[PDB]
């Protein structure tokens, strides 16, 4: 006896650890590559794309 | 027969006697012990040699991620 009581109090009083990030810079590494997708690549690309449409109009016509 | 309870008396007596003279295997003598000692070890084997008067606690970590 008294062992269970020891373990009991210690268990109820106790908290176990937690597990934690190695990486929440990945979260951000996105928005940077997302800048890559849009502005950097988007804009120059967008301009080309648009032009072809208008182009196609006249070359249909 | 007729004695119902007078028999139970006869049985009863020795139960108290042994308890009020506790020591070894109780009037049994060593013979109970010799079995007991093995049996107690065997049960330890079923749970391994982990102490039962200790409280366990450890930490736990992390691995590769994506």
UniProtKB/Swiss-Prot annotation, chain A:
List every position bearing N6-succinyllysine. Answer: 15, 22, 32
PTM sites of type N6-acetyllysine:
9, 15, 22, 32, 54
Provide the protein's localization.
Mitochondrion; Mitochondrion inner membrane
**Which family, according to UniProt?**
Belongs to the ATPase d subunit family.
What is the role of this chain? Answer: Subunit d, of the mitochondrial membrane ATP synthase complex (F(1)F(0) ATP synthase or Complex V) that produces ATP from ADP in the presence of a proton gradient across the membrane which is generated by electron transport complexes of the respiratory chain. ATP synthase complex consist of a soluble F(1) head domain - the catalytic core - and a membrane F(1) domain - the membrane proton channel. These two domains are linked by a central stalk rotating inside the F(1) region and a stationary peripheral stalk.
- Summarize subunit and interaction data from the UniProt record for this chain: Component of the ATP synthase complex composed at least of ATP5F1A/subunit alpha, ATP5F1B/subunit beta, ATP5MC1/subunit c (homooctomer), MT-ATP6/subunit a, MT-ATP8/subunit 8, ATP5ME/subunit e, ATP5MF/subunit f, ATP5MG/subunit g, ATP5MK/subunit k, ATP5MJ/subunit j, ATP5F1C/subunit gamma, ATP5F1D/subunit delta, ATP5F1E/subunit epsilon, ATP5PF/subunit F6, ATP5PB/subunit b, ATP5PD/subunit d, ATP5PO/subunit OSCP.
What's the name of the protein? ATP synthase peripheral stalk subunit d, mitochondrial
Traced from the root, the source organism's taxonomic lineage reads: Eukaryota, Metazoa, Chordata, Craniata, Vertebrata
Q: Gene behind this chain? A: ATP5PD
Summarize which stretch of the complete protein this chain spans: 64 to 124 of 161
From Swiss-Prot, chain B:
Q: Which stretches are annotated as coiled coil? A: none
Q: Does the keyword Ion transport apply?
A: yes
List the keywords (alphabetical). Answer: Acetylation, CF(0), Hydrogen ion transport, Ion transport, Membrane, Mitochondrion, Mitochondrion inner membrane, Phosphoprotein, Transit peptide, Transport
Localization, per the record, is: Mitochondrion; Mitochondrion inner membrane
Residue numbers of N6-succinyllysine PTMs: 49, 64
Per the similarity annotation, which family is this? Answer: Belongs to the eukaryotic ATPase subunit F6 family.
What is its biological role? Subunit F6, of the mitochondrial membrane ATP synthase complex (F(1)F(0) ATP synthase or Complex V) that produces ATP from ADP in the presence of a proton gradient across the membrane which is generated by electron transport complexes of the respiratory chain. ATP synthase complex consist of a soluble F(1) head domain - the catalytic core - and a membrane F(1) domain - the membrane proton channel. These two domains are linked by a central stalk rotating inside the F(1) region and a stationary peripheral stalk.
**Name the UniProt record assigns to this protein:** ATP synthase peripheral stalk subunit F6, mitochondrial
Gene from which the chain derives: ATP5PF
**Covered residues, full protein:** 36 to 101 of 108
